């Protein structure tokens, strides 16, 4: 079916929970043996969210190559994404090692450091120009270059230096700061505006390594971001845009990381975002 009328049909029939449960039932199950090794326990935020072995990002290190991160490679859309958890106190150095090694140009953050009175990820970037951060375990230096605070998002320019080689690179930090503590946004307008600011920066383009996107677990809000982006690109590429099937695209992405889209409310919100975005594009 087309999307917008499928949407009204599910609203009128009140069947979002049933639709979402059939996605959960049909989703891929692949092994995640490396994530569950005892030596990696303090590298995982949640025991039930792990990268599959076949798609996990490997650190270029011989002692321990493990990080909770997955490569989502969308063949028809010609887009790739790295989805990861919010960094932990012991994995902030690993996180920036991955950004360096994968040649990424942008980091997309969809949570606040504290939500619901609890810590959702480490403070992993510097807040003042004159107070830079050094990660001694991975030999990287990180400096805040500039910061632009807007009503619904903040963009930061960061400098990452590989202290072994003295090479430097500019990284863009795109921080969506207004997702509510509970539920989903009432309108997709600010989330879509944010997506197109990330696009305009070059951070999603083939000249660069894959964008790194995270929230707390790296599956819910993060899944909404890449699902909306890929569906809108497919609608531009195909002769028949009404042929884009958001449930089929989501099951394709779940071949690469488990659990993407965590609630029926996030599923409905993803439909809303694609429907409303399709109109602005033209």
UniProtKB/Swiss-Prot annotation:
Modified residues (N-acetylmethionine): 1
Record note on what altering residue 50 to A/D does: No phosphorylation
Coiled-coil intervals: none
Record cross-link N,N-(cysteine-1,S-diyl)serine (Cys-Ser), residues: 215-216
Domain Tyrosine-protein phosphatase: 3-277
Tissue-by-tissue expression: Expressed in keratinocytes (at protein level).
GO molecular function: cadherin binding; enzyme binding; ephrin receptor binding; insulin receptor binding; non-membrane spanning protein tyrosine phosphatase activity; protein kinase binding; protein phosphatase 2A binding; protein tyrosine phosphatase activity
Any single GO CC term annotated in Swiss-Prot or TrEMBL for this entry: postsynapse
Name of the protein described by the UniProt record: Tyrosine-protein phosphatase non-receptor type 1
Gene that specifies this protein: PTPN1
